[PDB]
Design a binder for this molecule. Structure first.
Ligand SMILES: OC[C@H]1O[C@@H](O[C@H]2[C@H](O)[C@@H](O)[C@H](O[C@H]3[C@H](O)[C@@H](O)[C@H](O[C@H]4[C@H](O)[C@@H](O)[C@H](O[C@H]5[C@H](O)[C@@H](O)[C@H](O)O[C@@H]5CO)O[C@@H]4CO)O[C@@H]3CO)O[C@@H]2CO)[C@H](O)[C@@H](O)[C@@H]1O
Ligand SMILES: [Ca+2]
Ligand SMILES: [Cl-]
Ligand SMILES: [Zn+2]
Length: 509
């Protein structure tokens, strides 16, 4: 009989949970709170005509993929930024409060949709249009598709003119400085064949941020949208890191320090959110937990359940090259936040791409719910899962926080102290709404694979809870269903036994 104690103090460690951590990149069967227009296809996206290039994902084809995949009405295909406006219109219609639009910095964007771009057509060439961050001439709502340039600030002007600036209810709140710069030379060799240098990325980031903020001083700039750890540490062995990196523990510090330096010289914040992608390298059962992981592999599934701990738990060492050789940089979130405090205080943190795998498996749902609890507890500002609607359990993990009852019910927006006596077999996150603890929300996850776990709750609150309604998902179904309510609470204490591999959302009042 596995017994675990959960102790909550609604008055201690109160901290706001950013509403934007429950987002997605793709269109999901879940209620999300942030939508990101990013990824490989956005690097060469031309807002003037909506064409884009697949790069290495698909024979370097320049075509209308984004219009088709984005479900843009055929009649708007030739309309400037229709890919983006359709994306944002959809977000607004679904009541999504935050939209993040990737801007182009690799250097060039598709001039057409004529198919494969040969190596002999590497930019510059008739197949590409050169990107310039600042037009330096009056903006037009009908950009010239005949000249050789595409302007980022004109692009932003078009959007602000349509939706208002970032400070308004319908404005687009954030812009990203392209996508995975350290992989430009690998993913988009036809646009940026040389490995990006640290100097180049900073120069571009500063220039694009300045250009954007002159049009919308309220917009938040996200960067550098690094693909993974190697980029975090050395910008994927950047050609100039041996010199630029002197005195810096990792590229992360260099980026923050240089962006702050530029902001200080300019007179305003140029980097609002440190943006990185985190695809777990954690392994189990002889395979990575994400990217083609086999749901039949029990060891992989168990490793998936524990992987979230690499995000915050100093005592957890995963089975991966990162856990083995980069302990000095783990747990990851605290290290990223520590760097921010040291080189650019006030900077926010976002994980714009992540996937713990097993999306169609219970462990993918529990890990997802765990990750979201972690993002909320440790101060992450925005997060957007990368994966399609087939990840039913991942979607359940999101809805457990954003719409657990199917009618808008959601986790509180203020995190409170909630400790568990066994972080290996369980996870628990608590929250209240605003500064009021009348209703106490609790995300309770039982990671026990084949046995139930009994939880003894002890809560300190100004209120005396008399009922705890429950909603949960498990191996039986990814549909979140309401369960029998907890009714025997004595002096804010009660015992609740949860079946193996179950994720619950308890609402006390
Ligand atoms: O529609 C008629 C038309 O079809 C043309 O052929 C199409 C084909 O029909 C489409 O299915 C195909 O779609 C692919 C896209 O071209 C390609 O850009 C896209 O690339 C994805 C990739 O699949 C995905 O893994 C990737 O995720 C990465 C993120 O982008 C990174 O940020 C992150 O770090 O890492 C993840 C991966 O872990 O995202 C990119 C997109 O950004 O994949 C699509 C599916 O394969 O396109 C074909 C060409 O347009 C046909 O040619 C025409 O003749 C016909 O009329
Ligand atoms: Ca142009
Ligand atoms: Cl990168
Ligand atoms: Zn789905």
């Amino acid at each position: 009989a596995k017994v675990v104690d959960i102790r909550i103090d609604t008055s201690a460690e109160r901290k706001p949970i950013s509403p934007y951590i429950y987002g997605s990149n793709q269109e999901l069967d879940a209620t999300v709170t942030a939508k990101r227009f990013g990824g490989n296809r956005t690097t060469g996206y031309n807002w003037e005509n909506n064409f884009s290039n697949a790069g290495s994902d698909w024979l370097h084809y320049s075509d209308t993929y984004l219009l088709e995949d984005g479900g843009v009405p055929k009649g708007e295909w030739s309309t400037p930024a229709s890919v983006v406006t359709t994306f944002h219109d959809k977000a607004l219609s679904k009541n999504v409060p935050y939209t993040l639009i990737t801007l182009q910095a690799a250097g060039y964007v598709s001039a057409d949709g004529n198919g494969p771009v040969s190596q002999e057509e590497t930019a510059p060439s008739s197949r590409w249009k050169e990107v310039k961050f600042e037009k330096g001439a009056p903006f037009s709502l009908t950009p010239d598709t005949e000249d050789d340039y595409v302007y980022m600030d004109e692009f932003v002007n078009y959007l602000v003119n349509k939706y208002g600036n970032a400070s308004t209810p319908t404005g687009i709140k954030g812009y990203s400085i392209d996508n995975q710069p350290a992989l430009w030379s690998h993913t988009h060799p036809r646009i940026h064949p040389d490995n990006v240098t640290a100097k180049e990325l900073i120069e571009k980031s500063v220039a694009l941020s300045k250009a954007v903020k002159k049009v919308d001083p309220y917009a938040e700039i996200f960067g550098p949208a690094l693909y993974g750890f190697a980029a975090y540490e050395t910008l994927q062995s950047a050609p100039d890191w041996g010199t630029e990196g002197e005195g810096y523990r990792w590229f992360i510090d260099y980026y923050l320090d240089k962006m702050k330096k530029a902001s200080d010289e300019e007179g305003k914040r140029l980097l609002d959110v440190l943006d990185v992608h985190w695809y777990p390298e954690a392994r189990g059962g002889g395979e990575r937990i994400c990217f083609g992981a086999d749901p039949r592999n029990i060891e992989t599934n168990k490793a998936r359940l524990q992987a979230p701990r690499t995000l915050w738990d100093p005592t957890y060492i995963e089975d991966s090259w990162i856990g083995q050789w980069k302990k000095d940089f783990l747990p990851i979130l605290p290290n990223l936040l520590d760097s921010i405090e040291k080189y650019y205080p006030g900077t926010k943190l976002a994980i714009t791409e992540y996937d713990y795998g097993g999306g169609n498996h219970i462990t993918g749902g529990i890990a997802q719910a765990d990750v979201l609890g972690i993002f909320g507890k440790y101060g992450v500002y925005l997060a957007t899962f990368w994966g399609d609607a087939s990840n039913n359990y991942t979607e359940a993990g999101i809805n457990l926080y954003t719409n657990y009852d199917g009618k808008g019910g959601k986790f509180g927006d203020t995190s409170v102290k909630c400790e568990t006596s066994d972080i290996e077999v369980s996870s628990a996150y608590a929250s209240i709404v605003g500064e009021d603890d009348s209703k106490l929300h609790i995300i309770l996850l039982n990671k026990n694979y084949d046995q139930p776990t009994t939880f003894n709750f002890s809560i300190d609150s100004s209120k005396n809870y008399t009922i705890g309604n429950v909603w949960a998902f498990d191996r039986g179904s990814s549909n979140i269903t309401q369960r029998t309510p907890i009714v025997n609470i004595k002096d804010n204490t009660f015992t609740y036994t949860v079946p193996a591999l179950t994720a619950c959302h308890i609402v006390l009042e």
